[PDB]
Amino acid sequence: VFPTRMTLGLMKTKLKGANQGYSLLKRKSEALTKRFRDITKRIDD
Amino acid sequence: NTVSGVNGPLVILEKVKFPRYNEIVNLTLPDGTVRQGQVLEIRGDRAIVQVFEGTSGIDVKKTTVEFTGESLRIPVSEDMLGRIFDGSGRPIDNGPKVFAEDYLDINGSPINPYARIYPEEMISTGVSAIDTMNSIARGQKIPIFSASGLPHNEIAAQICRQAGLVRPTKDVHDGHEENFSIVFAAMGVNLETARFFKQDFEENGSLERTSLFLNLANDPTIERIITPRLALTTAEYLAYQTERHVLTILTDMSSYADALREVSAAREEVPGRRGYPGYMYTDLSTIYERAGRVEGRNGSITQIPILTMPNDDITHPIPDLTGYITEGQIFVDRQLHNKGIYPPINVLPSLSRLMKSAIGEGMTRKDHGDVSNQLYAKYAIGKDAAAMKAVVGEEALSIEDKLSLEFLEKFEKTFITQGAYEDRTVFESLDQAWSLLRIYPKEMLNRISPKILDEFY
Amino acid sequence: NTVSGVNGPLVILEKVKFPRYNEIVNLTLPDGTVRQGQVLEIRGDRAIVQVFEGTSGIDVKKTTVEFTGESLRIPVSEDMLGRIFDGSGRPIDNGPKVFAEDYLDINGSPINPYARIYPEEMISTGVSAIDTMNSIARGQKIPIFSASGLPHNEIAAQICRQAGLVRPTKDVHDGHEENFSIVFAAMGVNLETARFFKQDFEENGSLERTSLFLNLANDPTIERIITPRLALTTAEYLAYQTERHVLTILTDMSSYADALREVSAAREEVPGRRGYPGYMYTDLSTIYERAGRVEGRNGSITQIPILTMPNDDITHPIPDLTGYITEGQIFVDRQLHNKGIYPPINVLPSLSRLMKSAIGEGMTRKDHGDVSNQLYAKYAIGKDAAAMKAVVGEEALSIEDKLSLEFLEKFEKTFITQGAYEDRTVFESLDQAWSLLRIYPKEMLNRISPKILDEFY
Amino acid sequence: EQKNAGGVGELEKKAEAGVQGELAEIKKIAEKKKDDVVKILIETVIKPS
Amino acid sequence: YGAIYSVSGPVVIAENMIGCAMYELVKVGHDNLVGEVIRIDGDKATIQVYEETAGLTVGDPVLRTGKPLSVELGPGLMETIYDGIQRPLKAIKEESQSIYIPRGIDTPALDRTIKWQFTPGKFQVGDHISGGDIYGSVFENSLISSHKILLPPRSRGTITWIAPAGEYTLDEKILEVEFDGKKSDFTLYHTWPVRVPRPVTEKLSADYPLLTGQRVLDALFPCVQGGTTCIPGAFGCGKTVISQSLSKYSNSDAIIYVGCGERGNEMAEVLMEFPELYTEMSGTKEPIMKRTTLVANTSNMPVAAREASIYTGITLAEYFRDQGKNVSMIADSSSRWAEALREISGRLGEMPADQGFPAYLGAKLASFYERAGKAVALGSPDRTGSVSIVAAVSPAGGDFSDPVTTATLGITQVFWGLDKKLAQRKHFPSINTSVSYSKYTNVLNKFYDSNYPEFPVLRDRMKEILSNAEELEQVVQLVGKSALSDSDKITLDVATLIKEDFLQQNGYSTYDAFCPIWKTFDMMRAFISYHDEAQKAVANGANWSKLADSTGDVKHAVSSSKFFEPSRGEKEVHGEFEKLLSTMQERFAESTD
Amino acid sequence: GNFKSKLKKAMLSQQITKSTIANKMRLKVLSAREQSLDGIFEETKEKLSGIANNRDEYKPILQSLIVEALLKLLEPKAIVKALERDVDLIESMKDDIMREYGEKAQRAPLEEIVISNDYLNKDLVSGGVVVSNASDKIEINNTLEERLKLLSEEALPAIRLELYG
Structure with missing residues (x-):
């Protein structure tokens, strides 16, 4: 149960918080695994 | 004259054009009982009445009306305490009627000699979480917002038991000097709980000091709404004529709201947003009007309305409109109740916007308003830090936030918690506030001027 | 001659059924104040009238009515321009008579000669963000969706005031052989705002290029929806008979929509979602029908309606219906206004769907289309880069992201940002674009043909 | 700024002279065609409108 | 005349109401209640009756007086509290013995015993006269004797009689005007319809800034005298404290305080507080009161009065405007007026279509607004008068998506935010640059440039610091901090300083009774200088931590600014802040190398 | 900086005279037309x-x-x-x-x-x-x-x- 009369406004911003996090965090993840791979070949040698 | 028709519980009388507005009429039914009804509206060669006893029995040609010639007014005595009444003030114990010394109007629109002096002296309800944070002043009306899934009836009860045991604490504080009296009105509340209310008055020894008006849901809707108006009027008489501090506890607003809603289903007057009347605001405001310092400025009436949110949200019509008429709000919450807390009071949306001005150092302390301000900011961060803690992990935590997480629990389980029978000194309350704050450095504080802090901390 | 009643804005006059629809009627008051109104409905021995000025204060017997015999039409003329009017098109300038050469209907269509030939040939607004990135060619109707969090009136003025100083520059390159006229319509406006538009125009010397119609917000709602209708008709006559390219600026569509929702208070007509009509489509369409290429097609009527989101909701019924009908949309966001960029048009979700169709040469260049692709794509990537920088830091960021970042700051602070009295012709804009894009090598520029890329980096 | 200390008062020399001839042709053709336009107005008003 | 057809709620319907209009003043019943015919349905008129019913019967007469319902504006408006129907509250306290209006009791609109000193105008006999021209003046208080007696809006003629200087009553005629035959005799009071916008010589664009006396309100977007403003509320965030506080701190020649539909306790507070406290205009013997004309409606009184409140209130600002007095009208809260409008909508039975709210609501809100603004005072001697409308908006259902707020933002050109989360945390009034705008800004910063300040430059940077902080905070919440740029950290830190010193202030700033522009500028100037030096300092190489540690002494000093009051430099320019700039420059020197 | 700013200012005041010339021409022409009509x-x-x-x-x-x-x-x-x-x-x-x-x-x-x-x-x-x-x-x-x-x-x-x- 969550408020019926004009929750819409808060709940929309929740979505925008979430959304921003997927893109940014995926960029961050992408970059760390790209580095990780570089290290892998170095460490092995 | 006679019934033309009945539309819903509303009864349509066809009658000749003479009656007063809000004039009591007595309907003679063929069953050995005569009943009273009040003209809700008077119109062109008909009047629509809702009859105060029962809802069935009206006939087409077997009915007779006679006009009483007098509109309903409540007959008031200050000897009305120490008596048990129903919703019409009739006795249920046989014998104690309202009786009179004066006759005063049920709306309280004629007299209205409400003082132009703003809430002054301190009032407490002996519950630390109420007293310190949203501090009660005489003549201040601040609502109790509750939700069902709660022992919300037990919270109301607790306040009724506590009211009048507070008063020697207050005498000593010098925010009371004069008699304390209770005016108690019940609307649509359970049988068990009605015995709990009588029992709480009995224990206190304030049974003599209180009046009980008892109104169930098997007593009519129109009659339900009248009940607090009778109570209210009697409180105004107590406050004005004999310069007393009157506390009227008015439960349950929600039941009162429904009753209003059931009507207008055959009135010409039309219902607005969410099927609630648009003049629902107007109805609330009539109830609320008797509240404030009386003229003589040695009496006052303080009013505590009890609202259970039937849907749980605060944007529901019943709470939303009330919060506006009042000056702040007090939030009880389901979540505290679940952990195993009593009385479970959340303080985060709870604020009273006329709190600072009323109170001063003479019956509180100057830090009373500062020490309260600090505790809201820290509690608020602790609550957001908790939500974030679940989702992301302990990655978004920072030093202040970890400290804030502990603060939340510390506050919840020591500060807000206390026994039903327990009551609390305001000065005591303030040392326990300081204690909780002692786990944070002083440089992190900023809702308190550095002068004030240095003295009491 | 006998006013029956008034029910809100809607006035019921009781007189015979011999008038026709939208025939002006005159309410003659004993106050010596003649007010005109237009019949909304005519029924048997009564008509329902909305009075343009006021709507109440008419007696029920001391009044007379007279019927004009003429349905409402605009006296239209080419000598009408350069003058300030009300919402009925009547001078407030203190100037001479309106003058006529024809009387044209303002009901929705005068002759409707909207072509079955699609848009080409550039119309320049003198704002870099709109013109290069979202090319508007005549007949197209692209709205500005702005919000109240932006200064919507000031941006609207900017488009008018800088528009038509683009034109000598166009004439030389040979885009326009015929002249340029502006029709500016202001709705439910504030007094400071009405004056502001005239002063801006006076300053540029665009005053006699345009006619300004002001309807003020104390003026009743019915006048307000009539205002753009008057404007749009005037424009269709200048465009058809004397062949001129006209840009019509209509602010505020949100106030027009409100008026439409507002009327209905004795009608048996019910609204749709959020209280806004089910027929809100129909009303929008009405403004929209006067917009497009005129017959003969060297003149045109070009429409830019301005819509203000009151609560930043793109799922709000007003923008949604409009958005479906319109050939793209311009989005203006609060965020950029906050950094202090002015105008703050984020070109991030903005689109012109007939972008290619507008450009050519002689008022554009060939290289216009390719550039539009480089700048949009690079910009989007620039926003994404800003978020990543905050996380990784400045000393741990990528080369590609670093470039994208540099572009974001310059793009915002040079292309979008322009001064209040600085005109940005399309040729001027395209040069500034090559400086920004230069920072990327040729290796990272590729949505550009190597032919172009070799000419201009 | 000296051409903006001379550019005022010069507005009215150019505003008058610029229509000096337009304002004479307006009053000229009005006196001519006056009875012949009036005579049409006379017919409409004095027979059903 | 008319015979009561039906009485439903406090609404009375009466048949046989012919040669009646739709704003008529009427006496309703045998009880002679004050009332007004809002609308008519055929012969049957629907009348809103401004005193309650409890005993008014059907078939009692209804007598139309032969004129609209108007309000009386004369002398003695100042230093007295009235209601929204405008009957003196004070006179009601003695005579009825009831503090608030009793039923069936009627009292005329102003006091009829009070005598005033009339001094002659600038007219003599046989002179042509017009409306809003000054026929005399009355020495009304001790702070102000600026109460000009005017010929009414919509009056012209020749003055047959000019009475000489002396003591008169306000019922005792002093003027005869003849227009075409006797127009009427005139007195000190004049009547004005509360349903019409008061005539004006011309409206002029706003361009003179009023200083609110609140550093924060001036800093982000300056107020103007002549303007329109929204301040969000929530009904438990100290909105009352800042309303009453603004009223004291803002300085105009006359102030009109209009309680729309209030707690009754809150109204009571202002009535008590104002003679106890002092003016900044050197007011004496009930200081503030002498400057205020007060309209008091509680929500518990009849709904008609509460409709009437705003309209009477605006007419009072407007009356004083024609005299050449600059007015601040603070109306609180406009959402309670809308709630009264929703009430009327359902009681008459008119259609609601504004989200369960009135048909008329959007237009009535605009109509009230347009009456405020800056103007050349009515009458030909030429004065400047202005009205700035500060109208509080607050929820009527949703947070900003309620009808009231949606309409108001459309029409308002100034909006100053108030966030709830910061309110509970005690950092009110909180102005958020995304939830705030001013369209008056560009003319206002150019005005302040003429006055001395560099103001426009400071505005852009103030905006930039707040603006980037909101976006960086969103990355902080989700991702966390493990890294956050050297530059980004600086912006966050400095934005905290701005919160604490400006945004937080309401009984926490020991000087706040009136704050000059120069002082605000000087304070913000130190903050912005600290910012630019700091970001340059990390880039030319120097750790973020070394930079915090060395700035040290000055950083505290800006943190503490808020308590400081003009006592050094000029009367508006403060030396501690001027000293601060130079010391800052020295800190940068230590910090870079 | 201020040369360019004061220069823009007077070039704007210059076009207000063009706007007053254009409004005064058109007001005279038209008010002579109205006088003939009456x-x-x-x-x-x-x-x-x-x-x-x-x-x-x-x-x-x-x-x-x-x-x-x-x-x-x-x-x-x-x-x-x-x-x-x-x-x-x-x-x-x-x-x-x-x-x-x-x-x-x-x-x-x-x-x-x-x-x-x-x-x-x-x-x-x-x-x-x-x-x-x-x-x-x-x-x-x-x-x-x-x-x-x-x-x-x-x-x-x-x-x-x-x-x-």
């Missing part, structure tokens, strides 16, 4: 009085004014306000006005013409009549001045095009 109309009403004051020439004109009004009235009694010399004029051709309505409408002859005791001034109108319903529910204001004013709406474009188009 001499066309002014002459119409000096000729109309001349016709009206010669009663025998006027007699058919009065008949057709009332009859024009009756076609839009369609009530069984009509109340006629006229000038002092024209209530007598009407009286002596009562039979011809109700005859001529019955032959020129479908509706059966007007049963009565009510000759009014309220009269029109030479100060308002040049003559003409106010034909109104019996219970005074509707008025067909068919006066000479009212008619010329109404005429002006349709005649204005005809005349504007011929003279200045």
